[PDB]
């Protein structure tokens, strides 16, 4: 079980979709030499936005953001990710998001947010 | 109290698959 | 900062969980990956919780823990020998945090398959104090 998200999930989905397209919206394909700056950008954007939009007073959450850029398989599945936790089921939680590329894009993004109260 | 620290990694450069080819019998003459 | 558990112990906890889950798989199977990851996550959580726990039981849980596990299939040749070689898709995973820098932390493990195995496992562990 999980605690209520400190930011509505629909807001999160758009903080996340926006951070992703900002970083990789103009990319033509997967380029491994750029993935580190791409993730650097994606994580910082999401983190800044959730810190900002979660607090009115002191900060009351710890946040962790994980981002994974994954190259598509060559066209004519192959990876599964999951998270378990031992936290406070009434205050703490996680949210995940897949930015799914089409065939021309050649890459997906997988984002996870974890929040820990106080 | 709580701050924004440096970022960390897991990383894997693309690597081509080892293709498996089809061979003929081979002719000794 | 420093983990509640020595990283050398973490490493054999993570390696044991991975072989407990996929040690006898002949191949990657997308139908079983959910069970496999469940399993790996479960095993690592129980174990890091145990080895965290002070002998003085009058002490309440000192850490929160999250375990993320990923299983990735190797590239499959077009036909479905030379020297063994593993094809892999590219990927990059990073993590940022808004944390207590001196108490909270992360640790990662990779379980690289050989060519015959056909898949890799990556594990991230997060600990949040208090």
Residue numbers in the entry:
A (entry chain B): 3 to 58, 63 to 82, 112 to 153
B (entry chain C): 122 to 150
C (entry chain A): 5 to 84, 104 to 153
The authors write:
Here we present the crystal structure of the protein encoded by MGG_01005, a gene that is important for vegetative mycelial growth of M. oryzae. Although there is only low sequence conservation with the Dynein light chain Tctex-type 1 (dynlt1/3), from yeast, human, mouse and fruit fly, the crystal structure of the gene product, MGG_01005, adopts the dynein light-chain Tctex-1 fold. Pull-down and yeast two-hybrid analysis demonstrate an interaction with the N-terminal region of the M. oryzae dynein intermediate chain (DIC) MoDyn1I2 as observed for other dynlt1/3 proteins confirming MGG_01005 as the dynlt1/3 of M. oryzae. Importantly, the structure of a complex of MGG_01005 with an N-terminal peptide from MoDyn1I2117–150 together with mutagenesis studies reveal that a di-histidine motif, widely conserved in dynlt1/3 proteins interacts with a highly conserved glutamate residue in the DIC.
Using this approach, and the apo-MGG_01005 structure as a search model, we were successful in solving an MGG_01005 - MoDyn1I2117–150 peptide complex structure by molecular replacement using PHASER implemented in the PHENIX platform (McCoy et al., Adams et al.). The rmsd after alignment of Cα positions of the A chains is 0.7 Å indicating that there is no large conformational change in MGG_01005 upon binding to the MoDyn1I2117–150 peptide. In the first, residues of 122–141 of the MoDyn1I2117–150 peptide interact with a single MGG_01005 dimer within the ASU. Inspection of the protein-protein interface reveals that MGG_01005 mainly makes hydrophobic interactions and mainchain - mainchain hydrogen bonds with the MoDyn1I2117–150 peptide. Among these interactions, E138 makes a salt bridge with K139 of MoDyn1I2117–150 and the F121 side chain makes hydrophobic interactions with both the T124 main chain and V125 side chain of MoDyn1I2117–150. At the interface with MGG_01005 Monomer B there are seven hydrophobic interactions and one salt bridge, largely mediated by H34 and a conserved EXPP motif comprising residues 132–135 of MoDyn1I2117–150. Here, H34 makes both a salt bridge and a hydrophobic interaction with E132 of the motif whilst additionally the aliphatic portion of the chain E132 of MoDyn1I2117–150 also interacts with H115 of monomer A by a hydrophobic interaction. Nevertheless, taken together with the Y2H analysis these results reveal that while residues H34 and H115 are required for MoDyn1I2 binding, residues 80–112 are dispensable.
